[PDB]
Structures are given as structure tokens and as C-alpha cells.
């Protein structure tokens, strides 16, 4: 819960971010960014979202005891975006 980076990104015209997430409570694995595809919002935002980053918060929500499907639903919950941006707190 230290050396954390706050990442802010707006989605594309199709409402996608360009990253993959693996893990969650049900899989007994931490939530990890498995891919960051080129030229996408997760690739072009500064600070950049990187592969291997562990997701800690999504729009301020603690994901520790949440299932993989709940994490994905949190990412897609556009109404929870502060000023239309998805906020992530990650551990590189």
C-alpha cells in the first residue's frame, strides 16, 4: 500500500481503454494489468498504465475482496468516472 501511482485516462470513441486485467478474489490472485495494447488510452496516458501493475483502487473503490467479474464491471461503470476519466491506483 506504498509506492502507488494514480492513473487517469479517458476512454476511446468506442468507450474502451486498451488494457486487459487478470485476477480477482474468486481466482485467489491479485488484480494485474496483463496487456496494454499500442496507441490506446491506457498506453498514451501520462503516467502510463504498464503490464504487471497491480490494481489497488478503481475510481476510489477498494478491489481487495472483489471478484474478477466485479472488477471488470467497476471499469465499465462510466457513471463512477470523475470528470469522464477512469481513475486507477496501482502498484508498479
Amino acid at each position: 500500500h506504498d509506492n502507488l501511482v494514480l492513473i487517469r485516462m479517458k476512454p476511446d470513441e468506442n468507450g474502451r481503454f486498451g488494457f486487459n486485467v487478470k485476477g480477482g478474489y474468486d481466482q485467489k490472485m491479485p488484480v494485474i494489468v496483463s496487456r496494454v495494447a499500442p496507441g490506446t488510452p491506457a498506453d498514451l496516458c501520462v503516467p502510463r498504465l504498464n503490464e504487471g501493475d497491480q490494481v489497488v483502487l478503481i475510481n476510489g473503490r477498494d478491489i481487495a475482496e472483489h471478484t474478477h467479474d466485479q472488477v471488470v464491471l467497476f471499469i465499465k461503470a462510466s457513471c463512477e468516472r470523475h470528470s469522464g476519466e477512469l481513475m486507477l491506483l496501482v502498484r508498479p
Binding site: 481503454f17 486487459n20 474478477h68 465499465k76
Partner: peptide, 5 residues
């Protein structure tokens, strides 16, 4: 399992 967002 990994999901595309």
C-alpha cells in the same frame, strides 16, 4: 481468466 477493457 483475463478480460479486455
Amino acid at each position: 481468466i483475463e478480460s479486455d477493457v
